[PDB]
RNA sequence: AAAAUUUAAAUUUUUUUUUUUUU
């Protein structure tokens, strides 16, 4: 029996708390998306950098601050703040065994009280992972060549600098990324908010003394004896430092990508496969299935690519199509904060 | 009616007796206003206009609930 | 008295007219967003009507019908809000459902419509457990033919109930009603997602347009 | 193709599978479907948990994200209607690395799948399509890329890329894509050529899978 | 005139009619005609006790009275249940005894009686008659298989509590009579639980009815016209129960008598704390039960 | 260590460094998270020492415990950055904390509903060349911009204010103190702590109103 | 010589990583 079956229509702040999906549904009838945007309308991103480290302040660096070099990462509706320590331990081509990473801790405060998340357990691994398959950083650059602090004339001490070349010591590094104000996906984020972070740290000089008085010391065995080594505990300066050096023309940045397939039952007037990248809007982050997300630096370069595809198929063309779209979302932002 | 008059004569005096912003460090970037941006075909940074989307939105409420009434259907 | 910032002391509880020589008294009542709070001041006590909120003052009256002059107080927000309007008893509440038992129903509480439409669905993540819960027990689905209940054939599990309140119950949960030919099942989808939209064939069944299938659902009526 | 596998190898556990590869062994197994926990229903869906051993230490966050890769895969996988308000915990152990862990996780992400995949098929749980994982990689110097490297030639590798694909009608359609794990340096032009060996060779996998079981559990059906 | 006892000894973790006494392991004996009850375990001759106490043998039965434990329940107590929760229409409650006693829904006296009956809508009102740790007056009904037993208010004599004030004791020392309601000069009234939990409240017109509106059977609020010699006559009651419960004191109703006007020579109501004053009037009341009966 | 976390190897250690009336100041900021319902931002500076800190929101969140008549309050507070508080320093704090707003909250309003209440202490500059002590009042009053954020019922714009050492919280003007916290200082110098911290609440409010009804 | 007399036992989920104790 042909019957016209009223249907029952809301406010669309009720639907999506509903359905996720249908509001979407609606969205794309439309051709928009549930942050009220067009299909490919992305987010602006603005930072700070430096704020937060001590050597913020090139004039007056502080005393009790403990931060290399900082930034502030706000785009849509989720501020990520990064922040960057590290520590020594002493130290006893594009190959991988050249290339080390950081250690960095992410919080997520999602509300929830408790341990550590699983979706952050992921996150500070998943980094550090592409980090090292980034090849950014040769230890080269974590090679300290300390100084020694001579006790000079009358009460005086001038830290002797050796330049251009017994122990060795090296740089160990951290992270901390805090999130607050979770709307999505959060990796790409995470990711390039680190970026400008890692442009922004100096080395700080470290020096050892000239002979520390930390000196060699024995244990006696039930009849035989040991020596322990000297302990040189290295400092480092109150004042100066150096800057970092990096592979920068390996310097990627993010982007995520969505692709769905469409109801013809959903549409409003005011197959049929759409590409959706900025992924956010819980409704999306549910509702997309097969997805890609991909590392790149600007000059067509490649850190990684991430493909999971459970939704729709992919075509060759989406991928050429996010490719396009890669490396356009990536060199602006290269551009854009000019660090 | 004095009474409460003279409540109200002794609400006067008490609520008688009763009777700018610069951000330093980070609310420079907290309550940022978000943007959106886009890019042609060249690939140049488009920043979305504020109205577009606000019309969209009136274009969304409109075609949602007076579509939605009626649905003749077999 | 327009705009008020929380603490905005507003109005004595009691005030004065003369409306044309005979003397007529207001009674200033304590609506939300209000509370009386005694005011000693150099000696003096003094109860005010205050304002515990942000927006608006708003003032009215209604007498009960089935020289002084009774005035409710009432505060609002003015130019998002649900803690405002949490559930009281008898409400109607939009809820999606969770677990299907053969004692019971379980549902939560997302969205409070209002009186004289007007709603307020709540803001919260349901992915945290968030939520405030009730349950639906199964004789209390409906009235009619209240004992040999067959719980599958009104309920499945993610669906829309305009349901209403019965009682507070416990902490934990509600205690939850649907028993009238005007509430029930507002809307899913078929096979619990796994198929398209369905719709309410008769207020006592519903069916799906393109599958041509139809389910037992203890529907609304539209 | 130094490949091999095992079915049904273990007791008291739904689906059981050893998977062995050219130098890793990883078993895995699967319980379900069984009663879910408070926190884990869903109301609709299949609930899945997934845990991974490794062979050496304990869990931590290195295994945590081959988890939950792997999470994601397998759901398409699953006909997660069938079982609603339900839970298969799934195991994955580690026993061999072929690989050194410090430095790559690649093998075992294709073996854990070639792995769980097996022993859904021991646990006969409704599911949907056939599925293969291989290791490829591209050598630094040599600029030349191996289908199934070693650990050596690992280290002498430039990227490193695990495909998992979704295959249908006698498992020879390309139903879609399930994981491309893109890792290491890499271009545009590489990429369509580095599906085009594994549009070939995981189907080839599959078609010797595909005997494999048959061969396994027919004499386990009853005539 | 004073604030604390602060007595010092320093240098020691501590200060350091005839019936069968037995323990547990210990043959009691192997007569097989003896029969075997309570805190009696066997085997086929051996009898042995399980707990600290006494031999009770009746007449062939032979069974163990410990000494320590929780309160006992037994059927057709009076006693006092602080609410402990609320069930499906069921409430739980405690006794201070091993479990809570359940209490069914229309267990109780409903305001205007009987001619309100029954109504599925009164189990949405469970919290509105009875909510957490009230107090009040209950009738113990019966038990189930375990030991666990039941109440209810089966008259206007029952009820919830007010328009005073709660102590507790040990079970022990109260003494067992066919009454358990008592009045006391001074217009107030103490409700001894069997259990070990005591009320003390104001007198009545329906105490005052027991020796010569129904609305308020579930309020919070009391007669509103109570002085303070009321309120500090309470407080010297208060007192003097715990003085004969630090005392190891059986409760006769004329006792407390005898405590209060012994305590009479104390107008200083804070002095009534003291642990050698409690035992001075602790020791006048029994030097005191050796002249009368 | 812990199998939970990269901590890095463990041989490694940070980074060790040696030697080679005034006016506070504020920026207050609300409508800025999404998760929440309530936010607050505040910048703080004050002749030393620079603050910035955040107190976020989740109510009305459901109790899966039992009844109550009536809400429940619960209060975090957690490093950020740089300054490291010790742990049993912090949620005395916490302590001290809850008891004010249990004279501000109608948790009558809401029966068997929560408050969560997070406080990042998350950046601070100390460059002087009781250290918590000298930021109690700065927390109340991010705590009540955000509450009246998520826009619960709440009696009074309750404020601390300061005087060395000191933190003594009022209402009504100053006409009562809700909140009482000393240290070391002075004896008798009570008189004038109440006045310091007195128009110090006298200046604050009066920012806090002008920060949510100029908006 | 009939007649008959007694009972009733309780249902559906809230938490923080493992050293390290005197040949």
């Known amino acids: 029996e042909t019957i016209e079956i009223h249907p029952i229509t809301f406010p669309p702040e009720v639907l999506a708390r509903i359905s996720p999906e249908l509001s979407l549904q609606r969205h794309l009838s439309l051709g928009i998306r549930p942050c009220l945007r067009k299909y490919e309308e992305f987010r602006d991103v603005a930072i700070e950098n430096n704020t937060l480290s001590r050597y913020a302040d ?282 | 009616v004095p009474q ?71 | 008295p327009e705009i008020a910032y929380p603490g905005k002391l507003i109005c004595p509880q009691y005030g004065t007219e003369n409306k044309d020589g005979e003397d007529i008294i207001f009674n200033y009542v304590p609506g939300p967003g209000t509370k009386l709070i005694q005011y000693e001041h150099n000696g003096r006590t003094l109860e005010a009507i205050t304002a515990t909120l942000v927006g608006t003052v708003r003032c009215e009256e209604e007498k009960k019908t089935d020289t002084v002059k009774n005035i409710l107080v009432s505060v609002l927000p003015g130019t998002n809000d649900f803690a405002n309007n949490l559930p009281k008893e008898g409400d109607i509440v939009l809820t999606r459902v969770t677990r299907l038992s053969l004692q019971r129903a379980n549902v939560e509480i997302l969205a409070v419509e209002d009186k004289p439409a007007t709603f307020s669905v709540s803001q919260a993540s349901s992915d945290l457990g968030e939520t405030f819960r009730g349950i639906i027990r199964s004789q209390d689905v409906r009235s009619t033919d209240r004992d040999r209940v067959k719980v599958i054939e009104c309920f499945k599990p993610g669906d829309i109930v305009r349901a209403q309140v019965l009682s507070l119950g416990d902490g934990t949960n509600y205690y939850l009603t649907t028993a009238r030919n005007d509430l029930g099942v507002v809307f899913a989808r078929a096979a619990n997602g796994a198929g398209g939209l369905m719709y309410a064939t008769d207020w006592q069944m519903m069916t799906s347009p393109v599958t041509g299938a139809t389910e037992k659902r203890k529907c609304a009526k539209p | 193709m130094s490949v091999q596998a095992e079915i049904g190898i273990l007791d008291h556990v739904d689906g059981s599978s050893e998977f062995v590869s050219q130098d890793t062994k990883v078993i895995c197994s699967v319980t379900g479907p069984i009663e879910p926990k408070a926190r884990q229903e869903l109301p609709t869906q299949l609930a899945l948990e997934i845990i991974v051993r490794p062979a050496k230490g304990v869990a931590t966050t290195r295994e945590k994200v081959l988890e939950d890769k792997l999470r994601a895969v397998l759901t398409p996988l699953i006909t997660r209607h069938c079982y609603p308000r339900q839970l298969c915990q799934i195991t994955c152990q580690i026993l061999e690395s072929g690989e050194d862990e410090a430095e790559f996780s690649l093998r075992e992400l294709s073996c854990c799948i070639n792995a769980a995949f097996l022993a859904l098929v021991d646990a006969g749980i409704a599911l949907n399509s056939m599925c293969a994982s291989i290791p490829i990689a591209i050598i630094k110097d040599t600029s030349d890329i191996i289908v199934d490297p070693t650990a050596e030639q690992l280290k002498i590798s430039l990227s490193v890329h695990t495909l998992a694909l979704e295959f249908v009608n006698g498992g020879k359609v390309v139903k879609n894509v399930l994981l491309l794990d893109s890792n290491g340096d890499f271009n545009e032009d590489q990429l369509f050529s580095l599906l085009e060996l594994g549009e070939q060779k995981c189907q080839e996998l599959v078609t010797n899978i595909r005997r494999i079981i048959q061969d396994n559990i027919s004499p386990r059906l009853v005539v | 005139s004073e604030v604390i006892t602060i007595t010092k000894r320093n240098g020691a973790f501590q200060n350091s009619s005839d019936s069968q006494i037995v323990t547990p392991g210990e043959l009691v004996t192997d007569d097989p005609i003896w029969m075997r009850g309570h805190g009696t375990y066997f085997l086929d001759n051996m009898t042995y006790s399980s707990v600290a106490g006494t031999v009770s043998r009746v007449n062939r039965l032979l069974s163990v009275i410990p000494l320590k434990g929780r309160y006992a329940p037994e059927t057709g107590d009076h006693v006092v249940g602080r609410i402990a929760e609320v069930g499906n229409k069921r409430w739980k409650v405690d006794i201070g005894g091993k479990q809570h006693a359940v209490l069914m829904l229309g267990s109780v006296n409903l305001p205007g009686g009987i001619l309100r009956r029954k109504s599925e809508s009164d189990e949405l009102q469970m919290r509105s008659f009875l909510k957490e740790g009230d107090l009040l007056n209950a009738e113990v009904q019966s038990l189930f298989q375990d030991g666990s037993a039941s109440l209810h208010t089966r008259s206007l004599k029952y009820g919830k509590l007010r328009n005073g004030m709660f102590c507790q004791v040990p079970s022990s020392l109260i003494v067992r009579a066919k009454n358990h309601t008592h009045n006391l000069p001074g217009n107030i009234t103490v409700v001894l639980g069997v259990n070990g939990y005591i009320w003390l409240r104001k007198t009545s017109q329906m105490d005052l009815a027991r020796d010569t509106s129904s609305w308020q059977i579930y309020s919070d609020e009391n007669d509103p016209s109570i002085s303070n010699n009321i309120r500090q006559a309470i407080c010297r009651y208060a007192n003097v129960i715990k003085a004969l419960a630090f005392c190891e004191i059986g409760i006769t109703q004329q006792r407390i008598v005898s405590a209060y006007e012994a305590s009479m020579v104390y107008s200083n109501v804070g002095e009534l704390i003291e642990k050698n004053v409690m035992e001075s009037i602790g020791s006048d009341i029994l030097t005191a039960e050796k002249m009368r009966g | 260590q812990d199998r939970r976390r990269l901590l890095g190897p463990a041989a490694a250690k940070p980074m060790a460094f040696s030697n080679t009336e005034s006016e506070q100041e504020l920026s207050l900021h609300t409508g800025f998270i999404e998760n929440c319902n309530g936010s607050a931002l505040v910048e703080a500076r004050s002749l ?168």
Not at chain 6, 145 to 173: C, P, Q, R, Y
């Open chain 1, 58 to 339: 090139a004039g007056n660096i502080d005393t009790k601050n403990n931060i290399l070099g900082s930034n502030v990462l706000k785009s849509g509706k989720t501020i990520v703040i990064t922040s960057i320590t590290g520590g020594i331990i002493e130290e006893t081509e594009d190959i991988i065994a050249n290339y080390a990473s950081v250690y960095p801790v992410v919080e997520v405060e999602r509300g929830r009280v408790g341990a550590c998340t699983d979706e952050e357990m992921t996150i500070s691994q998943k980094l550090h992972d592409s980090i090292l398959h980034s090849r950014i950083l040769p230890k080269k650059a974590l090679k300290v060549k300390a100084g020694v602090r001579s006790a000079n004339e009358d009460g005086t001490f001038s830290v002797l600098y050796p330049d251009e070349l017994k122990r060795k010591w090296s740089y160990v590094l951290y992270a901390k990324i805090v999130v607050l104000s979770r709307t999505g996906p959060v990796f790409d984020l995470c990711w390039n908010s680190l970026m400008y972070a890692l442009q922004s740290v100096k080395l700080p000089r470290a020096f050892i003394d000239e002979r520390a008085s930390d000196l060699r010391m024995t244990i006696r065995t039930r009849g035989r004896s040991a020596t322990i080594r000297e302990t040189y505990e290295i400092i480092c300066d109150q004042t100066k430092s150096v800057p970092l050096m990096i592979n920068a023309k390996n310097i990627a940045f993010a982007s995520n990508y969505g692709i769905v397939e469409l109801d013809p039952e959903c549409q409003l007037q005011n197959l049929n496969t759409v590409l959706i990248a900025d992924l956010d809007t819980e409704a999306e982050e549910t509702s997309i299935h097969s997805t890609i997300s991909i590392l790149a630096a600007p000059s067509g370069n490649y850190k990684q690519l991430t493909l999971m595809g459970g939704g729709a198929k992919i075509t060759p063309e989406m991928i050429k199509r996010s490719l396009l779209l890669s490396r356009v979302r990536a060199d602006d932002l290269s551009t854009r904060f000019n660090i």
């Open chain 2, 4 to 74: 409460i008059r003279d409540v109200m004569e002794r609400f006067s005096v008490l609520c008688n007796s009763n009777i700018t912003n610069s951000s330093i460090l980070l609310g420079k970037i907290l309550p940022r206003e978000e943007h959106d941006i886009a890019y042609s075909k060249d690939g140049l940074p488009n920043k979305v206009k504020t109205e577009d989307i606000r019309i969209r939105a009136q274009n969304f409420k409109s075609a949602l609930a007076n579509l939605e009434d009626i649905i003749f259907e077999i």
């Open chain 6, 48 to 215: 030393g020492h620079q603050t910035s800190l955040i107190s976020a929101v989740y109510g009305p969140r459901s109790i899966r415990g039992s009844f109550t008549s009536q809400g429940t309050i619960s209060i975090q507070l957690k490093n950020g950055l740089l300054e490291k508080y010790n742990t049993n320093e912090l949620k005395e704090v916490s302590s001290f904390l809850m008891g004010i707003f249990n004279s501000v909250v109608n948790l009558s309003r809401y029966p068997k509903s929560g408050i969560d209440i997070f406080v990042y202490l998350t950046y601070d500059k100390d460059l002087t060349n009781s250290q918590i002590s000298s930021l109690i009042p700065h927390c109340i009053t991010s705590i009540t911009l955000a509450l009246a954020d998520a826009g619960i019922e709440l009696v009074d714009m309750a404020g601390a204010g300061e005087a060395n050492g000191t933190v003594v919280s009022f209402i009504k003007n100053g006409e009562e103190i809700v909140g009482f916290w000393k240290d070391d200082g002075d004896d008798e110098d009570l008189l004038e702590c109440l006045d310091r911290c007195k128009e110090q609440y006298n200046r604050y409010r009066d920012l806090m109103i002008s920060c949510l009804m100029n908006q």
